[PDB]
Every structure is written in C-alpha cells, then in structure tokens.
C-alpha cells in the first residue's frame, strides 16, 4: 500500500524546460480505399480540346 | 546628345532586344543602344 502526496509547487518558480522544439508531422492514419466509379473513358479529341 | 540617324546595326540590336525584353520595356532596350533614348526606340519600333 502506497501513500501518494502531490508535490507542493513553488509559486516563485519560472518554467523549467524548453518547449519551442519542433519535429515534423508524423504519419497519418492508414489510407482509406477510394470506392470510385469505373474511370469514365477519355477520348483523344477531348484531351486535345 | 541622343538620337540622330538610325543605322542598320542599331535597328538589328533593337529587333533582338524587342525579341528579348518585349514591347513594354523600352528603357531596358535603350540601355542597350547608346545615343538613343527610350522614346526614340519606341518610336523607331512603331
């Protein structure tokens, strides 16, 4: 059995550690499948227009 | 002390400078041709 007391914080105490440090944005969640329609067909003439 | 008669050399440099700088930068073209100002280069073009 353990008795836990929260440490008493000094009011006259500035911030302790540097926070401005920055690392690049991590990977996003696993890619969702697209569920698209079957690729409507493209013609040479409209591709040229 | 600018202007006078136009020679073929100045006119061909004027043609090539219009090919490079366009018809809306005449003080960049007239820096390439001494004794000719920007109004003179524009007038000679048109």
């Amino acid at each position: 059995v353990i008795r836990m007391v929260e440490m008493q914080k000094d009011p006259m105490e500035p911030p302790r550690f540097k926070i401005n440090k920055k690392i690049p944005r991590g990977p996003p969640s696993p890619p969702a499948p697209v569920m698209h329609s079957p690729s409507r067909k493209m013609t040479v003439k409209e591709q040229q227009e | 002390i600018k202007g006078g008669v136009w020679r073929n050399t100045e006119d061909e440099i004027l043609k090539a400078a219009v090919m490079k700088y366009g018809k809306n930068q005449w003080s960049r073209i007239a820096s390439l041709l001494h004794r000719k100002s920007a109004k003179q280069c524009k007038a000679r073009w048109y």
């Binding site: 911030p15 926070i19 920055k22 944005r25 | -």
Partner: protein, 76 residues
C-alpha cells in the same frame, strides 16, 4: 526561387492549442484575458425557441408581404 507562389498552404495542428496546448505554455496574449464571460440568451419577447416552435410562419410572412406591397402601392 525566392519570389515564388504557394501551391499548398501551411497545415494546422502544430501550434499553441493543438494537441497538448503546445505542451502547456505560460505565454498568453492580452486578447486572451477573460472578456465577455457570460453568454446572453434570447428572452421571451426577443425570439426564444419556446416562442418560435408554435408559430405558423407562412401566415405572418404572407401578411407582412401584403402590407409591404400595399405600402409600395400607396406610395406610388
């Protein structure tokens, strides 16, 4: 080069309030002091949702439309 467009914006989620309050900073603006700390609500005469619920809007709208058309007619 130096002079260039954007073609993509800067994304949000990595500064001052975004995920861990930027790890709990002790820096705060003068625009972030307490101000207007009490939401005003609609009273019974204003347009409270108790009064808006039973109202037939089409009859009142048609009456106001008729009065506006009559005012525009009687003007000229």
């Amino acid at each position: 080069t130096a002079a260039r467009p954007t073609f993509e914006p800067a994304r949000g989620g990595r500064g001052k309030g975004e995920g861990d309050l930027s790890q709990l900073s002790k820096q705060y603006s003068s625009r972030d002091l307490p101000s207007h700390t009490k939401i005003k609500y609609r009273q019974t005469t204003q347009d409270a949702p108790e009064e808006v619920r039973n109202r037939d809007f089409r009859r009142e709208l048609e009456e106001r439309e008729r009065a506006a058309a009559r005012e525009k007619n009687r003007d000229r």
